[PDB]
Amino acid sequence: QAATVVINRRALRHNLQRLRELAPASKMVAVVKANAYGHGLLETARTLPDADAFGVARLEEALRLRAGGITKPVLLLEGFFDARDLPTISAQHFHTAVHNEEQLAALEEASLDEPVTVWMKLDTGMHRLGVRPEQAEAFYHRLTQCKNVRQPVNIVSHFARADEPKCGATEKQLAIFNTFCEGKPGQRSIAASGGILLWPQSHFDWVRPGIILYGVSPLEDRSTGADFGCQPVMSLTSSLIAVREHKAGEPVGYGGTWVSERDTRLGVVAMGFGDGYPRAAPSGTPVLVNGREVPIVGRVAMDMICVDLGPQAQDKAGDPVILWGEGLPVERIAEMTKVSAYELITRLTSRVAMKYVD
Amino acid sequence: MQAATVVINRRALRHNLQRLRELAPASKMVAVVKANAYGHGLLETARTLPDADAFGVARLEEALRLRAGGITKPVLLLEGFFDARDLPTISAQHFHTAVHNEEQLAALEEASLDEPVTVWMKLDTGMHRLGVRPEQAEAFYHRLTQCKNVRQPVNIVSHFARADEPKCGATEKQLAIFNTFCEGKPGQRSIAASGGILLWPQSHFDWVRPGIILYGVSPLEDRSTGADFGCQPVMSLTSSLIAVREHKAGEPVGYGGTWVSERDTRLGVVAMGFGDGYPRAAPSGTPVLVNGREVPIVGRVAMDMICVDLGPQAQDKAGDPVILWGEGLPVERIAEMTKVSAYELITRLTSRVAMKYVD
Ligand SMILES: *Cc1c(COP(=O)(O)O)cnc(C)c1O
Ligand SMILES: *Cc1c(COP(=O)(O)O)cnc(C)c1O
């Protein structure tokens, strides 16, 4: 009963449906990269057979989905990293982003038994992956002439600042996208969680929900998944392993970073940065013990967190702890720790047990 | 082109255990391999180190994973056991257990085990995390000496809170409490982890417990490195470039457009992000090696990708090797630049990274 991630399948199902309601003329790429944002790659795909496609960061992730029996299209959002992977991508029926000359040249040169669906990736201001506007027309035209590309060619981009509604970058990216796509056949996709929730004019043909599919807000404005009618999917849980007396004036943890002002009782939780809980968490960060809120005291260690229960607290070794979950949104922990909700949910280690419910 | 990969140098690990033996040549070694061996691989790290006298783990589950992989060496449960029903298993697996609370002691008192168990009584000397407080320790100790389920002698363990701070008199106060309690008791004594081993030779006693320094990473926050102490870095975190792209002066990069280029340049995109374990806290200017040479992170680290500034006519290509930390770039340098503990950097990696073992 130590560090466990409990994944609520009913919440997942709900969220995909709730997102369809917000984007009712758009198909869904369920984004499941990085072990489905910490929720389990294969189990998340298995929970969502109504998704129109799954979205992954890397070919290895797509192959893992196929290995576990997943048959729906998988979009390689970064494309492919070696020309020698094209026969697999063709045979496996993965759709691929194409963002550079190397990938384009490989598609021109290869002999494949079946052509492949492509999403040409346009750099519209993020400046990470993608073909730049001034190179994009010639690039696109070569893609349309490739016998190894199943026509028409689709067009994809991604917003850098969709979470800042009051700033002009999204509208700039959008106008670049729209200028490029004019008169072209091919499906259009630019919106992920932020686009879906705040930019209805960015929905087009396909949207790609990631963090909000897991019932977690993409914004850092205090909002939670529930503010958009999405239900939190993950709870990170554990157990007390000690309840101990502690006297006034006595420090706790490494570096003696917290000192009690009174006599009290401390709880020790079987959870640490070796499980994925941020070492950054300050004293005062909320944890739930038997469902009431108590503060972290002293530094988070690799395997343990101390909490302040109070001097006659009746909590005991064995009792349930919620790091985030029912009553304690991950976005609250994000705000209190200054750690992005994205990183909190995703950057867990393999030590955490995975449990699925409903 | 290789994706997010941890490369674990077995030769370095073996070197480190022997180095640590040279620094504390009268003490036995508990190799501390909790949290997937500080990111290096629980079972493979233990397989690399047959010379260790024991292996230390945080939780029973980790000890059972060692036995399941065929490690037969003594394993110490540093936090003891969380359920009384664990005792038969602990007994029959020959796991050594810390004991630090009443629940554990009463469980030992009313079990009837096939074989008695080796116990290390955990004393709170001032960390105030686990252990028995001094005013309860004599009575608690006596009860262990009278328990038929405990092999005699009862051994004695504690742990330093601030051993990385020599100008602090905290460590000395811990040692005075520890020595007072151990006076005239027959068991083995163990207080020192990496910081105690390196800086406090009067803390070595019968058994020392290297964690971080075993992996060639310094336990201190003063920009010292494992090599400061003659230890060799074990882990390299590596990847490859997936794109090299033109970029213009006045142009932003990444989410929030937090870095803006002052020149026309080329950027590199690495197959590495916080989805692999690389910290999202890394600021612009954090170093990475591309083809052996240092280049800076530009813009925020993403879940799967990191952007670096290569230069206006750089010849780096998609596919080229990238070192996040490793040869020519110690994890402690990343720790300094990101303001993250080196403990966290090496340990808080996800299952996405491949594990490769060399030498
Ligand atoms: C990660 C990602 C998404 C999903 O992002 P969220 O903000 O988590 O919804 C969509 N598109 C691309 C290209 C991505 O890399
Ligand atoms: C974590 C731990 C160690 C190892 O600590 P380092 O600072 O990594 O050497 C040793 N003993 C105990 C009880 C521990 O919890």
Residue numbers in the entry:
A (entry chain B): 2 to 359
B (entry chain A): 1 to 359
Question: Could you share sentences copied from the article?
Answer:
In this study, we have addressed these questions by focusing on the two PLP-dependent enzymes alanine racemase (ALR) and cystathionine β-lyase (CBL). E. coli CBL is a homotetramer that catalyzes the formation of l-homocysteine from l-cystathionine. We have demonstrated that two non-homologous specialized enzymes from E. coli are as little as one mutation away from being physiologically relevant replacements for each other.
Tyr-274′ is found in the innermost part of the substrate entranceway, and it is conserved between bacterial alanine racemases. Given the location of Tyr-274′ at the entrance to the active site, it seemed likely that mutation to a smaller Phe residue was useful for allowing the new (and larger) substrate, cystathionine, to bind productively. To confirm this hypothesis, we used x-ray crystallography to solve the structures of the His6-tagged ALR(Y274F) variant and an inhibitor-bound form. As expected, the Y274F mutation had no significant effect on the overall architecture of ALR. In the wild type ALR structure, the hydroxyl group of Tyr-274′ forms a hydrogen bond (2.6 Å) with a crystallographic sulfate, and it has been proposed that this sulfate mimics the position of l-Ala on its route into the active site. Although we also observed crystallographic sulfates in the structure of ALR(Y274F), there was neither a sulfate nor a water molecule in the position equivalent to that observed in the wild type structure. One implication is that removing the ability to form the hydrogen bond (by mutating Tyr-274 to Phe) has perturbed l-Ala binding; the increased Km for l-Ala in ALR(Y274F) supports this hypothesis. Removing the side chain hydroxyl of Tyr-274′ opens a pathway toward Arg-280′, without otherwise disturbing the structure of the active site. The conservative Y274F mutation enlarged the active site pocket just enough that cystathionine could enter it and form an external aldimine with PLP. In vitro alanine racemization assays showed that ALR(Y274F) had a 1.4-fold decrease in kcat and a 1.7-fold increase in Km, compared with ALR.
